[PDB]
Design a protein around this ligand. Structure first.
Ligand SMILES: Nc1nc2c(ncn2[C@@H]2O[C@H](COP(=O)(O)OP(=O)(O)OP(=O)(O)O)[C@@H](O)[C@H]2O)c(=O)[nH]1
Ligand SMILES: Nc1nc2c(ncn2[C@@H]2O[C@H](COP(=O)(O)OP(=O)(O)OP(=O)(O)O)[C@@H](O)[C@H]2O)c(=O)[nH]1
Lengths: 440, 453, 441
């Protein structure tokens, strides 16, 4: 039950998964080629990983159990050019012969399930190979409609298959100002529909805030998608460090899931990680974890276009990696109680899910952030995502009223009632978050 | 009247404190971490008695009469690897059910109910390996949900399986909870069974534990292992009255006779001076204290291992066991001074009780400043305060019913209504317990038998 | 019988360090608290019980609690006496370094953390049974020191009405900060009229002058004046720390020195002493004790009206010179016709466990006088306060707590302090008249 299965959907999802496996191998001292290098080396074996994500072969090789699904052959060739394809098994990566549409109208259609059948029998075979599963991991983007559609459909299918394991879906959210695809509002609304179908936990992230952080904190003139993927790898590594390494406060993933959902329905918690600064600035600063916590509470370290200072406080989790002092976290919670900025809900108020990982944080050399011996990750629920969804819904309703692309949609196989129900679901989720904020 | 006692390790905290307690006992009785008595088996004369807690298969080996029960095999394997041959592998229970699916009391109760046959078989087999048995000492670790559920299951099995055995219990409460609702619910569900079946319960609030570990230790950061070391040293000091039997108290039943005024009041408040067998115990010879000062510290709130909340607290059974070279005149002086400085209920003329223990001939002798230590146990109603805030949590969360989708699985009731009714019944039970404790704080309690005959 | 020392302010910490060092050298205790005497002979004629607590280690912990708003001076005193004092007898209010030289901030610090000091003094008293009173070491000039002193004085008068409380207070020299320092003084002096059972006075200007006289370097360090005060306190306590037949209680000394509670401010004098030949006989010792250049306070009087005088001569003395000097002093000192011309001398034994002070075999003497010279310095301080108050309203800018919420109550408290010190000096100057006791004659 300890194993964890990860899925890589869409171009951005595949790139994110590449960065995640790169950072994973970099932390455990493993080369991107294989055999080994090296180990299973103190403590890269038990406690797993690397045997939770890196299934060990008979010869000691650690293959990461990841499925790279995308109907774009370019992304498949890209992930094949890397040495992780050699590390991966050829059956793990699923090549896409032809892209469904641009990008979601056919991805979530029957053309999606045609290959979903293949990927589901492959997942069944893999589960027969490696027994035990802690949670399903998903990596895709809302900008790439094919990725979002295929990921949502596969998530629904597997939740209908098992439904007993948690589902962690990473979705990249587009900035409200720039729209690389004018199809993306519809896609986001229909993806919110699929999340209303099944959503154990979904992570919202905007590329705009990350690029702003790279420009400001990392001092990058033009932030690259590689740096964003590296930061996502860092945050997901910090999340999974509680199960990978030993720690005084080791928290189960299902424990996170139940803690985030005290109400009958909670699906979308926002994330934040610290520290994210320049290498030279990291050499200039030697702050404790208390300042890291104080900075993580700010909207800057959220990596998303949402202000936690604006929205009301809800149940949150504070994970720490590296050297941690109990006096430090006590002073931190004291200063937090002294802040009194955000409004606390009636059930939670003195609620902070504290997690500790003894393993020091590790950053890639390509990333402009120097590796730190201490890191704090705050994952909280906020009503600002409701405001972002409301803006997206205003745009989608304007487009729906203009009915220009609804013709192409009904040509693709969509219906008016489907979009109406997706809009209703989005409005219902927004009103639900409004009400649970008002219940505070 | 002396019988053998078996230790029960439930939960991760339970197993850790059991490991620490057995290491402390091996240190006192020179047994070490190998299970083979570090002393040669040629010296038959032993002032102590390992038989009530150590089974002797070979002459030099003394197997601790304890069962290791948990759902996480990692900690059990770690303790077994550190204590090579010390523990019995056949007495290690994991059920191979995997990791706990959350911190719900229902999960632990279910995993104890399903695997009840195996644990009952192991307990019966351990009872077969002994002849004179008196009762068990259960470690709850009520801070954990699975641990609390397992403890409640073992209690509900042993209350009716062995009604002629006295069942003492040890509940460890946390200071702050990341999700106070779940831990409060687990502790309330365990306290329900504690009130129903448990014969004796010792509370352990982690706030005073953290405070003491920050005060006496040099390191500001507090580790859970040396914090459990405090509870293990406490349990060893209390069991000293049987392991190193004195001339007044020689049986756990006799010890609980002066500590249990009635089956209703079965929750005690502990206190202990600065320890001497802990990790950082070098800053103890600079105190220059006497036995009277030791008694004062035992009565001081800074040495209590639970949340004091001393607002004119009512005492019911104040008792103490003093280990070391103790003087009788200092004891009389301390009793005189404390009887002038301790609140007693006017309906009972019974004062505090003093007991003196003996030091082990193989324990490291300390300088004449902290050569003598002592433990104190006082029956106080302020213990319900530790639950009060907890009930407050209940009283402020039970109006909605959060985290209800997690206590529905595992237990016999999957519906929300039945779980809600069970939680309301547990709340009513703990409310009635608090009412009994607050009524015992009055003289009308004893006057109830005077008004009617 | 046991007495507890209270070191208030950095001045109090310094003088406590010096006095405890002096007593450890006298009683052979040293800076480590361990008995410097061999364990073969237990016969002793001194009494370390009222000032030192002896544990099973036979270590003598000084019966003193240090209270201050500045933790650095207390930490330094602990460093220079590592292993001597008890860390539990240390009180710094846990408020950081000092801030504000007004009496308001000090008294507010005392009121806020009064519970900790009460618990500390209760624990110290409960350590033994035979307790008699406390000793307060503070400077009236220091704002935090005077505030803490007044707070503890109020606490000990409304808490221990049976324990006589005496204090040591040093008035500042003729300087610039007095314009506010005097403020604190009179406020403390207010409490000194109400709750203080006894008080020994000092004037910093005369102290500095006399130190520059006895010391070769005129650059007198404050630690040298602290050493002088430690010597005078060890000298006045010699009858208590070394009692033989006559004087074994400070209550008896305050009986023979304090005739009435309204007059409990005594002026000390000590001569001759070092801080190596003998050239001052006991007769010379006493005539120097009378000399103004040997008193620890500015006399500023031609013929002060002595009410009750009492002295202790240290050294091996013959009663012949004693009687000669007594006759000469009676011919010199004037007493009021309504009071008694009482003169008492105590033969203070020397400690055989104390290293020999320079100028060996030189007999010395200490004298405590009740005259109208203390009221002269009191009048100087009150006149400075009246000028700086009725001329400038600046004290309404540095206040804390209840004093900062309204400055009119501060003005009223200062006016009441002026009124009570005026009534006190009027009672003093009336006692100088034979018509003071006219109500019975
Ligand atoms: N002070 C202290 N508390 C502990 C220790 N170990 C566990 N705990 C308590 O136990 C709680 C966590 O639950 P666990 O003891 O791990 O019980 P569990 O979650 O069911 O996990 P398992 O017992 O391994 O099955 C914490 O809130 C702690 O208060 C320890 O070593 N020291
Ligand atoms: N003779 C002597 N007097 C001192 C000494 N230290 C302080 N004083 C007295 O203290 C007065 C100055 O005030 P402070 O000692 O600073 O007291 P404060 O104003 O409350 O400030 P803090 O002590 O830091 O809280 C001077 O007028 C001195 O009379 C010392 O070492 N020797």
């Amino acid at each position: 039950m300890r194993e964890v299965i990860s899925i890589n959907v869409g171009q951005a999802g595949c790139q994110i998964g590449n960065a995640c496996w790169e950072l994973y191998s970099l932390e455990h001292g493993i080369k991107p080629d294989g055999h080994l290098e090296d180990g299973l080396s103190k403590p890269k074996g038990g406690e797993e990983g690397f045997s939770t994500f890196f299934h060990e072969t008979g010869y000691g090789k650690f293959v990461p159990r990841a499925i790279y699904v995308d109907l774009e052959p370019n992304v498949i060739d890209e992930v094949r050019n890397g040495p992780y394809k050699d590390l991966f098994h050829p059956e793990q990566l699923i090549s896409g012969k032809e892209d469904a549409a641009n990008n979601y109208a056919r991805g979530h259609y029957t053309v999606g399930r045609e290959i979903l059948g293949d990927v589901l029998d492959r997942i069944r075979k893999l589960a027969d190979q490696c027994d035990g599963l802690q949670g399903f991991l998903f990596t895709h983007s809302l900008g790439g409609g094919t990725g979002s559609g295929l990921g949502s459909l596969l998530l629904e299918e597997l939740s209908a298959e098992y439904g007993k394991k948690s589902k962690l879906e990473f979705a990249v959210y587009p900035a409200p100002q720039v729209s690389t695809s004018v199809v993306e509002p519809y896609n986001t609304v229909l993806t919110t529909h699929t999340t209303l179908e099944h959503a154990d936990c979904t992570f919202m992230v905007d590329n705009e805030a990350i690029y702003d952080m790279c420009k400001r904190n990392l001092d990058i003139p033009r932030p690259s998608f590689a740096n964003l993927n590296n930061l996502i790898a860092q945050v997901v590594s910090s999340v999974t460090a509680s199960l990978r390494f030993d720690g005084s406060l080791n928290v189960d993933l299902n424990e996170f899931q139940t803690n985030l959902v005290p109400y009958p329905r909670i699906h979308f918690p926002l994330v934040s990680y610290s520290p994210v600064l320049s290498k030279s600035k990291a050499f200039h600063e030697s702050n404790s974890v208390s300042e890291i916590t104080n900075a993580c509470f700010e909207p800057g370290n959220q990596m998303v276009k949402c202000d936690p200072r604006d929205g009301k406080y809800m149940a949150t989790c504070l994970l720490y990696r590296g050297d941690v002092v109990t006096r430090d976290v006590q002073r931190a919670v004291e200063q937090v109680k002294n802040k009194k900025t955000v409004q606390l809900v009636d059930w939670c108020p003195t609620g902070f899910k504290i997690g500790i990982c003894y393993e020091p944080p590790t950053a890639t050399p390509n990333s402009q952030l120097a590796t730190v011996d201490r890191a704090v990750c705050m994952l909280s629920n906020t009503t600002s995502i409701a405001e972002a969804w409301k803006r997206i819904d205003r745009k989608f309703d304007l487009m729906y009223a203009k009915r220009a692309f609804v013709h192409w949609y009904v040509g693709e196989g969509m219906e008016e009632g489907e979009f109406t129900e997706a809009r209703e679901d989005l409005a219902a989720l927004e009103r639900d978050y409004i009400e649970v904020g008002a219940d505070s | 009247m002396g019988g053998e006692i078996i230790t029960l390790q439930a939960g991760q905290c339970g197993n850790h404190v059991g490991k620490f307690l057995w290491s402390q006992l091996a240190k006192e009785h020179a047994i070490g971490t190998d299970g083979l008595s570090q002393l040669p088996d040629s010296s038959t004369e032993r002032d102590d008695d390992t038989k009530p807690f150590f089974r002797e298969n070979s002459r030099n080996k003394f197997t601790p009469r304890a069962i290791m029960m948990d759902s996480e095999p990692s900690v059990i394997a770690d303790v077994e690897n550190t204590f090579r041959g010390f523990f019995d592998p056949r007495n290690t229970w994991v059920a191979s059910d995997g990791a706990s699916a959350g911190n719900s009391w229902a999960n632990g109760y279910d995993i104890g109910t399903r695997n009840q046959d195996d644990i009952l078989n192991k307990i019966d087999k351990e009872i077969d390996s002994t002849d004179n048995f008196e009762g068990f000492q259960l470690l709850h670790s009520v801070a954990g949900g699975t641990g609390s559920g397992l403890g409640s299951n073992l209690l509900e099995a042993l209350c009716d399986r062995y009604p002629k055995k006295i069942l003492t219990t040890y509940s460890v409460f946390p200071a702050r909870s990341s999700e106070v609702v779940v831990q409060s619910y687990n502790t309330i569900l365990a306290l329900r069974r504690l009130i129903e079946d448990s014969d004796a319960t010792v509370v352990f609030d982690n706030a005073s534990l953290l405070n003491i570990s920050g005060k006496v230790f040099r390191n500001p950061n507090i580790d859970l292992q040396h914090t459990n070391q405090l509870i293990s040293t406490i349990i060893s000091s209390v069991t000293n009255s049987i392991r190193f039997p004195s001339y007044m108290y020689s049986s756990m039943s006799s010890i609980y006779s002066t500590l249990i005024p009635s089956p209703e009041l079965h929750f005690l408040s502990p206190s202990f001076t600065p320890f001497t067998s802990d990790y950082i115990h070098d800053d103890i010879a600079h105190k220059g204290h006497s036995s009277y000062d030791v008694m004062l510290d035992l009565l001081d709130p800074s040495n209590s291992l639970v949340s004091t909340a001393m607002n004119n607290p009512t005492y019911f059974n104040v008792y103490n066991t003093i280990i070391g070279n103790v003087e009788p005149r200092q004891i009389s002086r301390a009793m005189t001074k404390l009887q002038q400085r301790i609140k007693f209920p006017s309906w009972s003329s019974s004062a505090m009780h003093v007991n003196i223990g003996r030091r082990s001939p193989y324990l490291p002798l300390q300088p004449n400043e902290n050569e003598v230590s002592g433990m104190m146990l006082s029956n106080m109603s302020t213990v319900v305060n530790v639950f009060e805030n907890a009930c407050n949590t209940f009283d402020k969360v039970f109006a909605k019913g959060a985290f209800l989708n997690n206590y529905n699985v595992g237990d016999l009731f999957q519906s929300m209504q039945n779980v809600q009714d069970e939680f309301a019944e547990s709340r009513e039970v703990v409310q009635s317990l608090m009412e009994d404790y607050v009524a015992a704080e009055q003289d009308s309690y004893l006057d109830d038998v005077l008004v009617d005959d």
